[PDB]
Amino acid sequence: SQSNRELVVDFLSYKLSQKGYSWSQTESEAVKQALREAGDEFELRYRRAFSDLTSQLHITPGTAYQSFEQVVNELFRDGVNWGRIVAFFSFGGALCVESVDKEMQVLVSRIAAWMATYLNDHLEPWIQENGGWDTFVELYG
Ligand SMILES: O=C(O)c1nc(-c2ccc3c(c2)/C(=N/Nc2nc4ccccc4s2)CCC3)sc1CCCCc1ccccc1
């Protein structure tokens, strides 16, 4: 839904404010706060245990959605758990952060459309199948 939309933005803008950048190119906030937190732990703790997915996608302004998708597919080669969804978000942040690093901040809005597309096309059936976002929270919060 658009629940996923505003979630991609929260995660992205946070990841940028953290790197010193600026996105300007209730119980809900609890999910955002929870995803903000898990991504931070993901980065501190695991990110460097897996192959670098950003190394596999050579991000450019003329990169297509299906390029991104086919890379993101790799993440979920062995199924969907919440962790990999976290890693997914972390990935979008790193694409975003790298983009701004390389003077391609135009991509950022694209990367967010991309993730949102990927979420609804690939992951929402799972999330609702596994208790929605309020469930992710009860576990990882
Ligand atoms: O749980 C898993 O099975 C799992 N498999 C994972 C997996 C499976 C397959 C692949 C990978 C990871 C790969 N990851 N490569 C990445 N490279 C990058 C680069 C930048 C940002 C994010 C990423 S993720 C590359 C090869 C395919 S990631 C993952 C979750 C790791 C823990 C997440 C977490 C951390 C703190 C709090 C809550 C949850």
Provide the experimental method for this PDB entry: X-ray
Show Cβ contacts of residue 51 under 8 Å, excluding neighbours closer than 6 positions: none
Q: Which atom of ligand 1 is nearest to the CA of 77?
A: 9
- Give dist(CA 127, CA 104) in Å, integer: 32
Residue type, 53: L
Question: 98 CA to middle of ligand 1, Å?
Answer: 18
Q: Under a CB-based contact definition with an 8 Å cutoff, are residues 123 and 81 in contact?
A: no
Q: What is the resolution of this structure in A?
A: 2.6
Residue nearest (by alpha carbon) to ligand 1 atom 31: 83
For ligand 1, residues with CB inside 6 Å are 38, 41-42, 45-47, 50-54, 74-75, 77, 81, 83-84, 86-87, 90-91, 94, 140
- Give dist(CA 118, CA 57) in Å, integer: 16
Tokens of 109: 């809005």
Show Cβ contacts of residue 106 under 8 Å, excluding neighbours closer than 6 positions: 25, 61
